[PDB]
């Protein structure tokens, strides 16, 4: 299929109307970030030549 970018949401804009929240959600989200790699050492003489 052709991918839909998102659901359509027509904001009801007018020059004298505002939307004020009456409630809230305490939302916890995860963010995973790599920090380090495996520290590898190669003996060049032993690898190439044994």
């Amino acid at each position: 299929y052709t991918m839909s970018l998102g659901a359509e949401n027509s904001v009801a804009y007018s020059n004298n109307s505002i939307a004020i929240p009456t409630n809230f959600t305490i939302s916890v989200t995860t963010e995973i970030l790599p920090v380090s790699m495996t520290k590898t050492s190669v003996d060049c003489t032993m690898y190439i030549c044994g």
Binding site: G6, A7, Y13, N15, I18, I20
Partner: protein, 170 residues
């Protein structure tokens, strides 16, 4: 298409697999970059049909309905100003969908301010949003409201000067 050349190339091992894997990683990294930059909203916001923004003109940055590409005049000018085993993979997001993403972001930041970036899109009048931004930089609302026509005129003049500068500088 030489079979003997490929037979000699097989003596060198998996170099070709490494190069194809690296190029595939670059190719998916470009699509990941485009997703990270442009696909930050899951709602496709639309501007109202009536462009009553308290004197602020956004026609130079909103998409033109008359154009088949659905691009803004500034974006159309930007697209006009940019000109053996190799293949070019198409990007995951096409140009019209990227323009649609920018249009959704423009509609969100015009009709809702910064509220759509933190949750549901909360509508607010654009002069009130500009007053909120004025309060963010420490300027009182009255200064914005008293000189609203001057601020809208300066913004429109600056946008026109931006379009002229882009059209006049190679």
């Amino acid at each position: 298409d030489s079979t003997e050349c490929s037979n000699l190339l097989l003596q060198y091992g998996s170099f070709c697999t490494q190069l194809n894997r690296a190029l595939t990683g670059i190719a998916v990294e470009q699509d990941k970059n485009t997703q990270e930059v442009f696909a930050q909203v899951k709602q496709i916001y639309k501007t109202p049909p009536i462009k009553d923004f308290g004197g602020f003109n956004f026609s130079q940055i909103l998409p033109d309905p008359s154009k088949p590409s659905k691009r803004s005049p500034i974006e159309d000018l930007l697209f006009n100003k940019v000109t053996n085993g190799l293949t070019v993979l198409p990007p995951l997001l096409t140009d019209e969908m990227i323009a649609q993403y920018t249009s959704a972001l423009l509609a969100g930041t015009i009709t809702s301010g910064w509220t759509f970036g933190a949750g549901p899109a909360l509508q607010i009048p654009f002069p009130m949003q500009m007053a909120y931004r004025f309060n963010g930089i420490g300027v009182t609302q009255n200064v914005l409201y008293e000189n609203q026509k001057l601020i809208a005129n300066q913004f429109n003049s600056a946008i026109g000067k931006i379009q002229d500068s882009l059209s006049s500088t190679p």
